[PDB]
Structures are given as structure tokens and as C-alpha cells.
């Protein structure tokens, strides 16, 4: 009879970077889905393969949070087969996703005056990501036809890159947090319930 | 906000070797590079390297490769520059920068604030 | 490589005049440019970034104007704290780490 701590997740002072998204894990707790759902002030909580409505009524193994950082013109790569930067370098989600996109725009906590350059990005990659694959290698990217040695260079980039968060931006450049619920049913008692 | 506090004045003989401090009071280093860029008397800038310290990784110019050791200690928040093999070509200002990583650059570096108070290095024999 | 290439070398101005700095870069740098003040015996301080944006805390007589490979800086009504060197700094093409010669703006005696 432990609430799940939802609290550490969405309540959090600092979050991650999308290239680095951070996975809490949540087991061995009773959830109440519908008081997130009625927080009322996410600008986006959409819920794929599953109802938050009827969501209070269901028990799975583990549920994992992967929080993080994007801008706003990038909330849209967060959901099932989706291509960007986001989706194809730093987060992708499987077509045959079950869980739920939660994210509110955050440009009060992530913009200082003069910039928020703390949030980065993975801008380069040889290939796509796999359906929630992790990558925070800097190794510098060959963009080009010749060998980069592992020093930058003309064609020779630097994998990740940083956010410009000002806070007088457009809405598709103000910095929204991200937090992504994944369901997991394992072959083992369901420790995740709700009431 | 973020105030770059430099080591004192060096002097060195030809051959000896000089390594220069600069801790940041912004407590935590964070995503930024931190450069370090010489101004020999009476010349302009000249960028030598580079360090990231939430990754550990440096990159130096051309012309010092093999010479400056760039590093950075976190705890402390304090990033380090070892510049060996010294001549008289050597004697300049020191200066250390933050800076944002590039915004589609492509590269690890963008623009420079803030920057270091300076550090004084003269080598003469 | 990409070589920044400022003009004049030196700017006589008495104070309240407007004096225009230009710094032209050899290749085409979209508007990812920098403009740097080094007082006489100080650090350089950042005045300019994104090659019109000034920089927190930098007065206003100072504007930052160009894009693709012409750039000028104007310093508008000239006051007494200003008279330094003036750097300028691509970081859209390689190596983004090069500056430009510099210029002098001195007071006109």
C-alpha cells in the first residue's frame, strides 16, 4: 500500500538531456493514474494502446519513466513511428508502442537570461536508433569522405550539440520536459497496481 | 553568475614547464567547453584547446598538439592548462573561457563568455 | 580555411561620434558571428553573439549587424569606456575558433 513515487519523476528539479534520457524504474507500489491525468496543466498526455480513464484498473510488472529534455516543435517526434533528430538519433520509440507521452513546456525553469546552454542533443549518428536504445558516445562524427582521427575537423563533427533555451523564444524553441511511460507484463507477479 | 577566477603570474625558463589554474565560483562546471586562448604581446588571439568536462574529453589545436594538456576536476570545479616545452614565443597572456557547445555547428565550441582574468607567462632564458 | 579579415587597422574618434567596425569573412558564414572588447590590460569581454544579439549587460550604443560575409559593428554615441580593441569571431564553418586581426578604436587627440 506504498504510493508510487510520481513525485520524483514529474516533480523533479533537474532533468536529464535527451541524448542521456534518464529510465526510473517503478515497481512494488500502488499508482493512481488519474491524479497525473487530472493535473490538468500537461500540454500533452497522449496514452497509446491503453485509456488513462480505465487505467487505474490494471496491475504490470514494472513501469519505467524515461524523462528528459527537448523544445517544443520536437513534442510532436515523441510518439509511435516518428522521424527528426529526436526520434532517429537521441529517442525512439517502437511502432507498436504501449504507454504514454506526457510532457508540459517548461521555459520558467530551463531559460536563464542570456541562454540556457545546458541541455544537449545528439545531431549525428551512422545509423538510426532502436526502439528505446541509449547513446551518449563522443565520438567524433566522419560527416565527410576523409578519416577524423578522433580530432574535430571540416567534415569532422562533434556528435552532440547544445540547446539555445532563451526565455523569449518561440514556442517551437522553449524548452519542454518529456516524461515517457512504457507498461512492462513480465512473467512474474504484477507489482504495479492501482487501488 | 558564472566568474572565471585565474592562477597568479609565471615566470619559466626555456624547456621548463607551466600549468595554469581557473575555477569557475559557479559551483558546477556543467555542459559548457572550457578554451583556453593565448594573446601574445602586442598580437591577436590565438585559440590552443579545448576541455568538456562532464565528458572528459579534450581537443587541442594543431599547432599545440603534443605541448598543452587541457583538464578539468569537477569536485573542485576547476579547469587546468599545461602548456611544456616553453620558448620565448611562449610569453603571453593566458586567458580561460566557457562557452556553449555548437548550436549545428558541428562543433564543440561557439562563442566565448566568460572569460578568465588572465594569467601572465613570461619565458626568457 | 576561413579567414576573418577586419578593417581599418586603427579608428581616431572623439567621443560622441559613431564609428563603424567591419570585419568580412573569406567564405560565406551564414549570421553565426561574434564581437569581442578587450580594454587596454583586460580580458576580452563577449559584446555581440549570433552576429546582431548583444550580450547581457552590454550597453546599448553598441549594434552588431551583417550576415552571409559582410559584418559591422557600430558603436553609436562613443563614450569614454570604449575606447579598446575590437575582435571578431565566425564559428559556423572550420575551424570556428579563428578571430580577426582586431581593431583599434582610440580617442582623437
Known amino acids: 500500500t506504498n504510493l508510487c513515487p510520481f513525485g520524483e519523476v514529474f516533480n523533479a528539479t533537474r532533468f536529464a538531456s535527451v541524448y542521456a534520457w534518464n529510465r526510473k524504474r517503478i515497481s512494488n507500489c500502488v499508482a493512481d493514474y488519474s491524479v497525473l491525468y487530472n493535473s490538468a496543466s500537461f500540454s500533452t498526455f497522449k496514452c497509446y494502446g491503453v485509456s488513462p480513464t480505465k487505467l487505474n484498473d490494471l496491475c504490470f510488472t514494472n513501469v519505467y519513466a524515461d524523462s528528459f529534455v527537448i523544445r517544443g516543435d520536437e513534442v510532436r517526434q515523441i510518439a509511435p513511428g516518428q522521424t527528426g533528430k529526436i526520434a532517429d538519433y537521441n529517442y525512439k520509440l517502437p511502432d507498436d508502442f504501449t504507454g504514454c507521452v506526457i510532457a508540459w513546456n517548461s521555459n520558467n525553469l530551463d531559460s536563464k537570461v542570456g541562454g540556457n546552454y545546458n541541455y544537449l542533443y545528439r545531431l549525428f549518428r551512422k545509423s538510426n536508433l532502436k526502439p528505446f536504445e541509449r547513446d551518449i558516445s563522443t565520438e567524433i562524427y566522419q560527416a565527410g569522405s576523409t578519416p577524423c582521427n578522433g580530432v574535430e575537423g571540416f567534415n569532422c563533427y562533434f556528435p552532440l550539440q547544445s540547446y539555445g533555451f532563451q526565455p523569449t523564444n518561440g514556442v517551437g524553441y522553449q524548452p519542454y520536459r518529456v516524461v515517457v511511460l512504457s507498461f512492462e507484463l513480465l512473467h512474474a507477479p504484477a507489482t504495479v497496481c492501482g487501488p | 553568475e558564472v566568474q572565471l577566477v585565474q592562477s597568479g603570474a609565471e615566470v619559466k625558463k626555456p624547456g621548463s614547464s607551466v600549468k595554469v589554474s581557473c575555477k569557475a565560483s559557479?559551483?558546477?562546471?556543467?555542459?559548457?567547453?572550457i578554451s583556453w586562448v593565448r594573446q601574445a604581446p602586442g598580437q591577436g588571439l590565438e585559440w590552443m584547446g579545448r576541455?568538456?568536462?562532464?565528458?572528459?574529453?579534450?581537443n587541442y589545436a594543431q599547432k599545440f598538439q603534443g605541448r598543452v594538456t587541457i583538464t578539468a576536476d569537477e569536485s573542485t570545479s576547476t579547469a587546468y592548462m599545461e602548456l611544456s616545452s616553453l620558448r620565448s614565443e611562449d610569453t603571453a597572456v593566458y586567458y580561460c573561457?566557457?562557452?556553449?557547445?555548437?548550436?549545428?555547428?558541428?562543433?564543440?565550441?561557439?562563442?566565448?563568455?566568460?572569460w578568465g582574468q588572465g594569467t601572465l607567462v613570461t619565458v626568457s632564458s | 580555411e576561413i579567414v576573418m579579415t577586419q578593417s581599418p587597422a586603427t579608428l581616431s574618434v572623439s567621443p560622441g561620434e559613431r564609428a563603424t567596425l567591419s570585419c568580412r569573412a573569406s567564405?560565406?558564414?551564414?549570421?553565426?558571428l561574434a564581437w569581442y572588447q578587450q580594454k587596454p590590460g583586460q580580458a576580452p569581454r563577449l559584446l555581440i553573439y549570433?552576429?546582431?544579439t548583444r550580450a547581457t549587460g552590454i550597453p546599448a550604443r553598441f549594434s552588431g549587424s551583417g550576415s552571409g560575409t559582410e559584418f559591422t559593428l557600430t558603436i553609436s554615441s562613443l563614450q569614454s569606456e570604449d575606447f579598446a580593441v575590437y575582435y571578431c569571431?565566425?564559428?559556423?564553418?572550420?575551424?570556428?575558433?579563428?578571430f580577426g586581426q582586431g581593431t583599434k578604436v582610440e580617442i582623437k587627440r
Open positions: 569571431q565566425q564559428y559556423s564553418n572550420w575551424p570556428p575558433w579563428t
Open positions: 573561457a566557457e562557452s556553449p557547445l555548437g548550436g549545428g555547428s558541428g562543433y564543440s565550441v561557439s562563442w566565448f563568455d566568460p
Open positions: 576541455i568538456i568536462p562532464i565528458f572528459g574529453s579534450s
Open positions: 567564405q560565406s558564414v551564414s549570421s553565426n
Open positions: 549570433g552576429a546582431s
Open positions: 559557479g559551483g558546477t562546471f556543467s555542459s559548457y567547453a
